[PDB]
Structure 1
Amino acid sequence: LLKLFTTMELMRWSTLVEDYGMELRKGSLESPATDVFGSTEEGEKRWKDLKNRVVEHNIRIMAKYYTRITMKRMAQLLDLSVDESEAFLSNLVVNKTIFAKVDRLAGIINFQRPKDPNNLLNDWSQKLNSLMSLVNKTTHLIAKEEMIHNLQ
């Protein structure tokens, strides 16, 4: 459960079927696994919520990542196919708080979502970081060079 939540990295739905469907037969507690998974009229709606969990498990880290990957590669790394991608990603683009990017044009998508409104942070990051690290390069490299010629 926690491993499905720390940095999350991908998941396979069938390995989850294994790990959390052998718990519906293995008994130590048996009633919460019944109420969440073993039940049908609500437990199967919670299986649907588990499908929400596996697809949001996809979508959260794929909103964190994947700048310039294609689409069939996307669906096969979603572990759910392209029609399943339009279903399973329409019902989380109705979340309408993650901005992503797809195109067709033959079946090929792209990325870099904000269309880069930046020439500013290039200067900021690049030049301020590099120039201040270079003014540190004096203050501490000649410090260590003077140290290694204190000890010589």
Structure 2
Amino acid sequence: LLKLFTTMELMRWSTLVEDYGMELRKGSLESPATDVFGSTEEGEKRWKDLKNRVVEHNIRIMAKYYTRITMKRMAQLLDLSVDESEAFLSNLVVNKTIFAKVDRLAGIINFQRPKDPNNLLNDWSQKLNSLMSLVNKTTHLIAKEEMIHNLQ
């Protein structure tokens, strides 16, 4: 639950394979795991759509960061084929991936670098940066100027 809470670090599910296996083996708690796998197809849909759900959720988490994870290398670190990653993109087109940038020559994707209208985006960033430097520069300047008065 803590790994699924937030800031999901890219980890291998093989460590979770034995966790789920012993989750089916031990009967002290969470016993009805065989009842979760009761149906021949329902448990398979919950498992495939479960690993799919976390392999999409971690993409939704790393999509906030603009670090350019270079999903071409990520497909190599995840040890999976690029075809089911294109199917994952087929899940992203319904997952509202409209804010993205792809490349015809290479395979690197970009979740940022829009047309960047200078009257809205650079306007906003320059407003928060310049104004934040102005008022933040204003607070501790005279605040420290009042802190040095106690030395007399």
Taking structure 1 as the reference length, the TM-score comes to: 0.73
Deviant stretches of 4+, over 6 Å: none
- Give structure 1 stretches of 5+ with no counterpart: none
Corresponding residue number in structure 2 for 1:104: 104
Instruction: Decide which moves more: 136-145 or 15-24.
Output: 136-145
Q: Distance in 2 between the 1:6 and 1:32 partners? A: 27
Alpha-carbon distance between aligned partners in 1 of 2:113 and 2:128, rounded to the nearest angstrom: 25
- Between 1:61-70 and 1:39-48, the stretch displaced more is 61-70
CA distance 1:19–1:113, change in 2 (3 Å): farther
Instruction: Give yes or no for contact 1:11–1:54 (8 Å, CA) kept in 2.
Output: no
RMSD: 3.0
Aligned to 1:19: 19
User: Do the aligned partners of residues 39 and 111 (structure 1) sit closer, same or farther apart at CA in structure 2, a change above 3 Å counting?
Assistant: same
Count of paired positions: 152
The aligned counterpart of 1:122 is 122
TM-score (norm 2): 0.73
Q: What whole-Å deviation, never above 9, does each CA across 1:60-105 have from its counterpart, x for those lacking one?
A: 1132224434342132355533223112332343333563333240
**Percent identical:** 100
Query: Quick check: 2:100–2:110 contact (8 Å CA) kept in 1?
Result: no
- Unpaired stretches in structure 2, ≥5 consecutive residues: none
Give how far 1:23 is off: 0.7
Structure 1 stretch displaced more, 56-65 or 94-103: 94-103
Distance 2:113 2:35 in 1: 41
CA contact (8 A) 1:70 1:109 kept: yes
